[PDB]
DNA sequence: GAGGGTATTCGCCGCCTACCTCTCCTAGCCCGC
DNA sequence: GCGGGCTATGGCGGCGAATACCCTC
RNA sequence: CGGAGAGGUA
């Protein structure tokens, strides 16, 4: 039909989708939202929680809390509880806290009682417990004013995971249980090869289990008894070199604590600390309902226990002995039976997603038990009588870890602000390497892979290219996390063949049991196939055919498994997995220009993909616009309320982008909730615009766009048609010191009037003076208590623009400033940055490269109507890369800018059949869309090339192959074959040449190795790698290769000599000795080694 | 191993992935066949004493070298009884 | 042998090196866990970076300030210990603990 | 590392369906990655040579 | 222009897997911010155009030139050392044309 | 002892050698290079220099 | 014994004698191979070296005092063990027991890691340097150029 | 038991180069003015 | 009462040496 | 400009 219905202000983007929509996408920031309001127990979470889990609504600081509560003395003569949980209103707007450098944060209160056990008073009070960051409206949280983002963690869910690693002796199966748990002690028991079982409590000596279990008590007869089909286990019952109880509990100890007098009581008492208890160990509810899920153990009773038991241990290790041998099911009494299997640790059901509310509570919990700590050791060094709650409380370990978590984490990400796109792919990522995680250094080759059960959960396309490839995922379109933390995706339950509605979102683990049906499979509209051979996922992601009977379940959308920013790739079926790949972590660096075009040929997924990022300015509810301006939109609600939306005009984001806004909407138009009322950074009319429509040929030329590289004409140049806006944000402050008067004043010590004209009456430049690089932006002057250095802030190396805002924040004016400063002045310079050789241009489709050369408009191949094409692509890179899909949207970007016009004069065409009405004919400029695997056919492709309208002349430039025939600009002469032509989206990505180009003749040199400094930043030089020694060496070129580690980098008389003999004319001087090779000399002997040069 | 693995074991010498055993005498073999092992022993046509490789998994795969080895066949001094790669060391 | 340095090496040698040796690297003795006043921010005395065993921290510049002048070069101080010369002896003379 | 029986059956010019994409992704992935960890061993190989 | 005339220039590309990762060029002054590289050492520096950079390094004095105007310079250096095969041979484009 | 130390495990190769009192003839190439002297080969050879 | 003779051999054939193994004084970094750099606003970073340094130095102090004080060998025995395990982590870190950590649970860079790893001396100053007279820019295709 | 011959286990070492951007670099507490 | 200084368990392979288990005198 | 962490380019 059309873009959608659910929009009120959607363009008009019709759509080649045969298939229809079961289902909407969800609000894609919905994950981080609904996993924080859990966290802090929100109403709109407890009305979620109430239409299905209404038989326990607890949130994370109650839950933490109730787990904690309540804390007694070792006597049981008094107590401190806590409960109800309770936020106040943040204390400044989040505008207010980005601008200022405050964190977005909300106070929390909690109701403490103490309980004295021997005289019944109660003492209850409303103890403050810190201020708590908050969550924004789209999923970031404000920390010292910077935006950062939660990154979800992919953790190994806790719990008993066996498996079957084989043996290089015996050569069979040799089983191996790991009880996984929550901030508990692992409590492995292998299959020790020569047919033993064993255990190994922690990481110490591997003693047998028939001692653990005489260490519980059990007698030899009954453990042959539950044990009696296990020949292992009765091998390890009569050879255990060990008898009785005593024995094998002071054996525990001898490992537990050496020492220490083993004494049986000790013994006991650790058997059962360690495990049994739930201070020290805490399987959470995540990992009991796991454990009980795959043992079977207790499916009614609900989860209302985090600690091991007997059963745990016993059932864990019968289901270990009945995995060797050959069982296929065990039937462990007081439960339902279970098969008996190893466990996936890739499989999306063995591992689980903590999301931001989990990570924050685990950062409470910690800081909690420190605070525990503290409030039992103060509990009895305390008279009673004079105990309050308020005096035993000790915020600081609290307040301190989520400091401590908001600041120095690997979850705690800098948020990226490239453009609208790379923030919500952000937001909506899954980093399987954090503390509890994998590292990146040792992760393996089974984790950086495309599981199976990542169909619908994680996206298989969209990863890091480098050195993260495969442990940062991004979850797909449809997919959500459920209460424990696993992630579900809808399906649309299939019934008696018949394709219903009542959408259920399966997990992986029941998407396993059950066969899911590909969307695409062609549905007839009254619920039954038309083929009885489907497409489906058997059990262990097999895909195979089955009859319709044997299906169970489908697919909400042939687009299911593709992320947010690998849906918006027309055309992604056709290209390969790596090129998509490449598209889709391009499409979050293209940067903002200055102005904004929707793809003629984009596929759906960027209306939502704005509206559900939070740059567009969707209107909160219906209402006539009143006024409207550049920076304020003022719409008229139905209820005479008034509610200006404000405009946030060139901005900086996090990576000196434009954060542009601008209204759409005019004084009298009607907006509905939810409209889009103003564009964002890239963005056009609402819809994800991060690039511009191009036409591009598809011939080699002259060899400019040789290997990979681009040829743009000059138009695109002329035209700001490629020509992004930046900022940089320049800061300075006063420290007051030990010293004191750090005082930013105008007067510089020994310097110039002209230089100093710019600077205002305070020191600082007039805001629109063009400060070009090297230039004064804020005079300081450093009283070292004249003693006063001019350390003023300039223009740094490499900076230019004019000077749109500064930011001074005033001590005297009561402002929240760091701790002994005065001042903190703060400058933007912004400068528009046009298209140039070396900026790196790239399509949707992974056809990245650099611009080689910028034709002029007038020697470019220009069609039969003298229309010069913009961008010349080499032929060379397409059919090798498996990326022909920017050859079809090529095709379709001519047929949507040129218009069309299906001639069902007599019928409708044959291969116009199924393509949709409003399809048969558009005007030109007609925007479409290509869902991202249901979109444009070839025959239909083929079809609306055979008809296009005219130019303006009746003739047609581009035939039915889609080839122009073209004249060369430079020589005049048509070249002698038709050449591919067409308009092909391409972004203009955040690696810009002006930003890669450095030199450095002399400057700033290392202090401990006098060797010069690294990075463009501080001058610094480029390094002379050890396998760049190698290539001189192997050349024979031993000068240079002196030279350049001698007189170039560590020889300071050298270089001075060198400096001055090249100034003036003199020879090159001699060497020296390096400075790093006396620095190691140096090392050596501090070692304690007389380290010499003898002669 | 058949790639890098492969190039970085035989330039460090390792010991392989399997050390395929090495005739160390010429003369006739005596192969016997079992599981999990066999019982490849070369004749001495030097006229000294047998050699013995037994327990060697029979798993591992057989050599052809000039025929394919078996009972009877003739090996040289440094024939490869099995087959894959060899220690570095022992030739 | 060949002191600091200066290109005619052969057979650079190591070795253990005995208490006797390194006492004879040292300049001095460290005996104060300090590294730098505050207030005055200049080197403590016999801590860390004390300029009586490593060496002046400015060129030419004793702590005291009895001497300033490159004309007086090669003196030790009278009144603070710490001996006149190049600010770059700081890398290389060696401090000890007894 | 076994072969898919199904096998993939649509080239990249008729475009692949979800679950040929999906099963084709599977292969890709694997030679990213092994690409990446390759060259670190053979920069390491080289160093020690 | 008249200063960087006949002053051989050690282009750099890392990783520099082989000698010909390092070879000096004659410096042309060009209107732009990027570097041009003759298409044929490409292969050698097994450099593309999609976004790699590399680095440029002066030799300064006398003997330094020198390695740099004979040793390494691009023009001598055709055969690859591993087998002797040319590397400044023309592929893609100039292989289709 | 220094091209040892520089390639690896640098700790038991110094231990090593400060045991065995190993004296260390500056005559390879890491090591002229470490100590910035021209290596002997190619054009440093003591034919060509 | 051939394992041992491997290392009595080397003391019986040379000067030098086995008693540098036992310190009795223990050599200082010279500071600007060890400095500390002073941000703005009083953030004085001292390296981890001066941080080991002044550990070894308290305790030597520590036990000085306690010996001229006079005390129990009991007591002076266990400041000795002290003053051998600072030294222990100043040579080499974390190489017995758990490493003197730092702030935010980091252990820190003894002398044994200066001279150790990619980040080490040896391969990161020496072998490899940083040159003046170099830049860095993205490379394009220039057809109309000379090999 | 000593002793030796075999295994068995744990500690250590190693894991491409080059470059760009960003954010944090302590916390608790005890003594002094 | 507030400021400043002083102290405090998802890597993996290779390899060697520091050490369990069993026959012999 | 020293350390730790994160992201990214080839
Ligand atoms: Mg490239
Ligand atoms: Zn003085």
Redesign the interface.
């Given at each position: 039909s059309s873009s959608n219905n659910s929009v009120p202000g959607a363009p008009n983007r019709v759509s080649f989708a045969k298939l229809r929509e079961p289902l909407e996408v969800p609000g894609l920031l919905d994950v981080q939202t609904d996993s924080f309001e859990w966290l802090i127990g929100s109403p709109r979470w407890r009305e979620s929680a109430a239409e299905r889990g209404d038989v326990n609504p607890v949130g994370g600081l109650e839950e933490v809390l109730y787990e904690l509560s309540p804390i007694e003395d070792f006597s049981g003569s008094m107590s401190l509880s806590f409960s109800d949980p309770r936020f106040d209103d943040v204390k400044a707007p989040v505008d207010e806290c980005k601008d200022k450098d405050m964190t977005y944060a909300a106070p929390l209160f909690v109701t403490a009682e103490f309980i004295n056990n021997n005289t019944g008073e109660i003492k209850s009070q409303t103890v403050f417990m810190g201020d708590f960051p908050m969550m924004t409206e789209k999923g970031t949280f404000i920390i010292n004013g910077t935006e950062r983002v939660v990154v979800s963690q992919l953790v190994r869910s806790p719990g008993v995971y066996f498996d079957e690693t084989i043996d290089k002796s015996t050569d069979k199966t040799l089983h191996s249980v790991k009880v996984i748990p929550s901030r508990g002690a692992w409590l492995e028991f292998d299959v020790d090869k020569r047919d033993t079982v064993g255990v190994r409590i922690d990481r110490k000596r591997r003693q047998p289990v028939t001692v653990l279990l005489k260490a519980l008590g059990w007698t030899s007869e009954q453990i042959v008894e539950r044990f009696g089909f296990s020949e292992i286990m009765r091998s390890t019952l009569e050879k255990d070199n060990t008898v009785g109880t005593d024995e094998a509990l002071l054996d525990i100890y001898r490992k537990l604590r050496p020492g220490e007098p083993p004494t049986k009581e000790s013994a006991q008492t650790l058997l059962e600390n360690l495990f049994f208890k739930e201070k020290r160990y805490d399987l959470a509810r995540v990992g009991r309902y796991k454990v009980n899920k795959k043992l079977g153990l207790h499916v009614g009773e609900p989860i209302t226990s985090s600690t091991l038991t007997e059963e745990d241990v016993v059932a864990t290790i019968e289901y270990l002995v009945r995995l060797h041998e050959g069982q296929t099911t065990m039937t462990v009494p007081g439960g339902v039976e279970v098969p008996v299997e190893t466990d996936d640790i890739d499989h999306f059901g063995n591992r689980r997603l903590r999301t931001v509310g989990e990570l924050i509570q685990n950062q409470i919990r910690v800081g909690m038990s420190r605070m525990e700590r503290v409030v039992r050791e103060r509990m009895t060094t305390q008279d009673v009588e004079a105990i309050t709650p308020q005096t035993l409380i000790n915020i600081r370990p609290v307040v301190a870890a989520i400091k401590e978590f908001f600041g120095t984490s690997q979850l705690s990400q800098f948020m990226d602000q490239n453009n609208p796109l790379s923030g919500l792919t952000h937001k909506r990522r899954l980093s399987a390497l954090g503390p509890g995680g994998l590292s990146r250094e040792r992760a393996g080759l089974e984790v950086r892979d495309v599981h199976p059960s990542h169909y619908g959960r994680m996206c298989p396309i969209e990863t890091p290219e480098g050195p993260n490839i495969g442990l940062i995922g991004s979850l797909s379109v449809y997919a959500r996390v459920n209460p424990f933390g696993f992630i579900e995706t809808p399906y649309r339950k299939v019934v008696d063949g018949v394709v219903s509605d009542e959408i259920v979102y399966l997990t992986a683990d029941e998407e396993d049991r059950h066969v899911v049906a590909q969307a695409n499979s062609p549905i007839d509209a009254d619920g039954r196939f038309v083929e009885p051979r489907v497409l489906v996922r058997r059990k262990a992601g097999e895909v195979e055919y089955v009859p319709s009977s044997e299906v169970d379940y489908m697919d909400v959308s042939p687009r299911q498994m593709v992320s947010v920013a690998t849906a918006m790739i027309p055309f992604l079926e056709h290209d390969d997995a790596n090129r998509a790949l490449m598209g889709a972590n391009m499409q979050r660096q293209a940067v903002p220009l200055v102005r904004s075009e929707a793809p003629l040929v984009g596929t759906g997924m960027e209306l939502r993909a704005a509206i559900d990022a939070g740059d567009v300015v969707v209107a909160e509810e219906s209402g006539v616009i009143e006024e409207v301006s550049a920076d304020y939109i003022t719409v008229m609600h139905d209820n005479g309320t008034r509610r200006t939306y404000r405009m946030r005009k060139f901005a900086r984001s996090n990576h000196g982008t434009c954060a542009n806004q601008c209204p759409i909407v005019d004084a009298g138009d009607r907006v509905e909730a939810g409209q889009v009322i103003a564009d964002g950074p890239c963005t056009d009319d609402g819809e994800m615009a991060l690039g511009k429509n191009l036409l591009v040929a598809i011939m080699p030329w002259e060899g400019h766009n040789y290997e990979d590289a681009i040829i743009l004409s000059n138009r695109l140049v002329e035209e700001d048609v490629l020509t992004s806006i930046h900022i940089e944000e320049h800061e300075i402050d006063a420290r007051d010191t030990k010293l004191g008067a750090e005082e930013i004043t105008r007067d510089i010590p020994n310097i110039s009037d002209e230089v100093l004209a710019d600077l205002d009456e305070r020191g600082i430049v007039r805001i629109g003076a063009e400060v070009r690089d090297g230039d004064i932006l804020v005079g300081k002057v450093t009283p070292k208590g004249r003693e006063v250095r001019d350390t003023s802030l300039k223009v740094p190396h490499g900076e230019s623009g004019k000077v749109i805002g500064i930011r001074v924040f005033s001590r005297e004016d009561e402002d929240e400033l760091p701790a002994g400063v005065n001042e903190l002045v703060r400058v933007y310079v912004a400068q528009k940055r046009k298209i140039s050789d070396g900026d790196k241009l790239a399509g949707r489709h992974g056809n990245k490269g650099v611009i080689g050369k910028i034709l002029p408009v007038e020697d470019m191949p220009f069609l039969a109507d003298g229309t010069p094409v913009d961008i010349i692509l080499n032929t060379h890179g397409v059919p090798r890369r498996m990326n022909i899909g920017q050859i079809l949207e090529t095709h379709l970007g001519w047929c949507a800018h040129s218009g069309w016009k299906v001639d069902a004069a007599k019928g409708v065409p044959d291969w116009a059949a199924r393509l949709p009405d409003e399809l048969l004919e558009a005007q030109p400029n007609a925007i479409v869309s290509t869902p991202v695997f249901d979109g444009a056919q070839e025959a239909e492709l083929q079809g609306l090339l055979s008809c296009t309208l005219p130019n303006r002349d009746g003739d047609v430039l581009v035939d039915a192959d889609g080839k122009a025939m073209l004249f060369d600009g430079r020589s005049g002469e048509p070249f002698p074959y038709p050449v591919t032509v067409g308009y092909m989206y391409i972004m203009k990505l955040h690696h810009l040449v002006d930003d890669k180009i450095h030199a450095r003749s002399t400057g700033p040199y290392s202090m401990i190795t006098q060797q010069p400094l690294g990075g463009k930043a501080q001058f610094g030089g480029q390094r002379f790698g050890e396998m760049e020694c190698w290539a001189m060496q192997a050349y024979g070129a031993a000068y240079t290769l002196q030279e350049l580690l001698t007189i170039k980098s560590d020889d300071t008389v050298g270089r001075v000599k060198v400096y001055e003999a090249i100034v003036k004319g003199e020879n090159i001087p001699e060497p020296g000795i390096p400075e790093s090779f006396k620095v190691l000399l140096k090392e050596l002997q501090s070692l304690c080694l007389n380290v010499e040069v003898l002669s | 191993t058949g790639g890098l693995p492969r190039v970085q074991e035989l330039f460090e010498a390792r010991v392989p992935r399997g050390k395929a055993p090495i005739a160390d005498v010429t003369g006739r073999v005596r192969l016997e066949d079992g599981e999990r092992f066999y019982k490849i022993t070369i004749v001495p046509d030097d006229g000294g004493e047998e050699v013995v490789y037994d327990k060697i998994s029979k798993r591992q795969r057989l050599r052809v070298f000039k025929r394919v080895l078996s009972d009877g066949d003739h090996v040289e001094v440094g024939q490869q009884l099995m087959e894959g790669s060899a220690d570095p060391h022992e030739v | 042998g060949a002191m600091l340095d200066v290109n005619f090496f052969d057979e650079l040698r190591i070795g253990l090196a005995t208490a006797e040796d390194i006492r004879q690297w040292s300049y001095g003795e460290v005996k104060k866990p300090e590294t730098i006043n505050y207030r005055t921010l200049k080197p403590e005395k016999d801590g860390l970076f004390c300029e009586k065993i490593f060496g002046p921290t400015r060129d030419w510049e004793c702590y005291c300030g009895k001497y300033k002048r490159v004309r007086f070069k090669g003196i030790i101080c009278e009144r603070c210990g710490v001996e006149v010369t190049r600010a770059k002896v700081r890398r290389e003379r060696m401090g000890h603990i007894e | 590392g076994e072969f898919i029986p199904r096998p993939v059956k649509s080239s990249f010019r008729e475009g692949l369906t979800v679950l040929e994409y999906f099963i084709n992704t599977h292969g890709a992935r694997k030679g990213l990655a092994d690409t990446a960890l390759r060259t670190a061993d053979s920069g390491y190989l080289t160093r020690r040579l | 222009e008249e200063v960087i005339a006949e002053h051989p220039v050690l282009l750099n590309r890392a990783p520099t897997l082989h000698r010909l990762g390092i070879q000096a060029f004659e410096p042309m002054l060009v209107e732009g911010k990027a570097i041009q590289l003759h298409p044929l050492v490409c292969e050698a520096f097994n450099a593309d155009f999609d976004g790699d950079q590399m680095a440029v390094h002066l030799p300064l004095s006398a003997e330094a030139q020198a390695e740099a105007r004979i040793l390494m310079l691009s023009s001598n250096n055709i055969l690859s050392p591993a087998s002797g095969r040319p590397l400044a041979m023309p592929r893609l484009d100039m292989v289709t044309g | 002892?220094?091209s040892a130390?520089?390639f690896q495990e640098?700790?038991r190769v110094?231990t090593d050698?400060?045991?065995?009192?190993?004296?260390?003839?500056?005559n390879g190439?890491?090591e002229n290079?470490?100590?910035?002297?021209?290596?002997p080969?190619?054009?440093?050879i003591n034919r060509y220099? | 014994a051939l394992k041992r003779l491997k290392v009595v051999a080397a003391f019986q054939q040379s000067g030098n004698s086995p008693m540098g193994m036992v310190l009795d004084a223990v050599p200082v970094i010279p500071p600007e191979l060890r400095p500390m750099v002073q941000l703005d606003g009083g953030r004085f970073a001292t390296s981890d070296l001066n941080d080991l340094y002044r550990r070894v130095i308290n305790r030597n102090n520590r036990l000085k005092r306690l010996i001229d004080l006079g005390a129990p060998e009991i007591i002076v025995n266990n400041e000795k063990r002290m003053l051998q395990e600072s030294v222990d982590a100043l040579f080499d870190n974390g190489r017995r027991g758990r490493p003197v950590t730092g702030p935010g649970n980091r252990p820190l860079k003894s002398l044994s890691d200066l001279l150790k790893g990619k980040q080490g001396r040896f391969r990161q100053n020496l072998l490899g340097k940083r040159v003046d007279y170099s830049g860095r820019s993205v490379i394009v295709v220039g057809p109309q150029l000379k090999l």
């Open positions: - | - | - | - | - | 002892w220094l130390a520089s640098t700790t110094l050698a400060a045991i065995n009192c190993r004296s260390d003839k500056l190439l890491k290079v470490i100590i910035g002297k021209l290596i080969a190619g054009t440093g220099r | -």
